[PDB]
Structure formats: C-alpha cells, structure tokens
Amino acid sequence: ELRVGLEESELWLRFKELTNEMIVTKNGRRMFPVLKVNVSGLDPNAMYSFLLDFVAADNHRWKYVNGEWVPGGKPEPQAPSCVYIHPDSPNFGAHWMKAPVSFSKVKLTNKLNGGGQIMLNSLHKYEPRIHIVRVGDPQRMITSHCFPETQFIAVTAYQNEEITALKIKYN
Numbered sequence: 001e002l003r004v005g006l007e008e009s010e011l012w013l014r015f016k017e018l019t020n021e022m023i024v025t026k027n028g029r030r031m032f033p034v035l036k037v038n039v040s041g042l043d044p045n046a047m048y049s050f051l052l053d054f055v056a057a058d059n060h061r062w063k064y065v066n067g068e069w070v071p072g073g074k075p076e077p078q079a080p081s082c083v084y085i086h087p088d089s090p091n092f093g094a095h096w097m098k099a100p101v102s103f104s105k106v107k108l109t110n111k112l113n114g115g116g117q118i119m120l121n122s123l124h125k126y127e128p129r130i131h132i133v134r135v136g137d138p139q140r141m142i143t144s145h146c147f148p149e150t151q152f153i154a155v156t157a158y159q160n161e162e163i164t165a166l167k168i169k170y171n
C-alpha cells in the first residue's frame, strides 16, 4: 500500500498550534520548517517524479488583530498554478523510499520574477500538497496527498512574535 508520512510532524504541530506563517518575498524565501516526507509502497523498480503545490484553504483572507488570526476580507483571485518539481525527479521508487524526501529548496514568492518559485497571495492560508507522477505511464497515473499539519498563512512579514521566536528557536 502507498503511504506518504509527514516527517517532523511534532515540529509542524508546534507551529500549527500558533497558526503557522511563511514569509513570501520578491526573490523568494525557503520554508521553515521544510516539508519532508517518508514514502513506502511505491514499486521500487518504477520511475516517479515528485511535485509540490499549495492549495488555497479558504474562501477568505486572514488578518492578525489583537494577537488573533481572524477572517480579513474576500480572497484575491487564485495565485497562478505553480508546481515545484522535486530536483531528484525522475527517479526510481527505491530512491524515493530509501530516505526522507525533502523539498528544502522550494522558494515562496509574491512576485513572478522567475526560477522554480511558488507564487502565493499574502494573508491567504495554503495547504501543501505532494503529487507522485508515474513516468512513462500512458494513463499518466498521479497520486496526491495533502498535509494538514503543514497549513500556513503567507505573510510579507511575521505577524505573531511567537512565530518569529519559534523560527529563531528551531532554525
């Protein structure tokens, strides 16, 4: 059976209990924590690509008011469909399963200024999603897992000083 488990789920959950925030910049910023997963139940002999995208969680944006995240207006039109291709792609099942798959190099941006970046809307909540694409497959079989522990609000600057302190503490 295919299983894709979140790595460092305890670390993610400590950010999630505060409401997680990820910085977006013109030139793009790496995530902390980094999304890493463990995989079992691929065909070790088959080749696959790993893709990462970010699904908009809500029909509204968010605002940080009096130390609280609250609904903060109607959402901006959906960010243009960005997919990050994991740099080990394509590769054998055995490769993806032997060690944690890390998306450490993906950069989150609020400006389409080129280079494997993901465009997000400030003050919107996203849920990371990983796709496993079977290579050479005439049925183009894809599998998709979502990681609710990894949900965050995209920000141009940290709102919650407690998130700022956690990012410093563990990073």
Ligand SMILES: CC(C)c1ccc(CN2CCC(O)CC2)cc1
Pocket (backbone or CB within 6 Å): 008, 010, 011, 014, 032, 033, 034, 170, 171
């Ligand atoms: C005690 C537990 C909560 C914990 C704390 C710190 C780590 C290490 N981790 C931090 C940042 C990641 O992007 C890579 C390494 C993992 C787990």
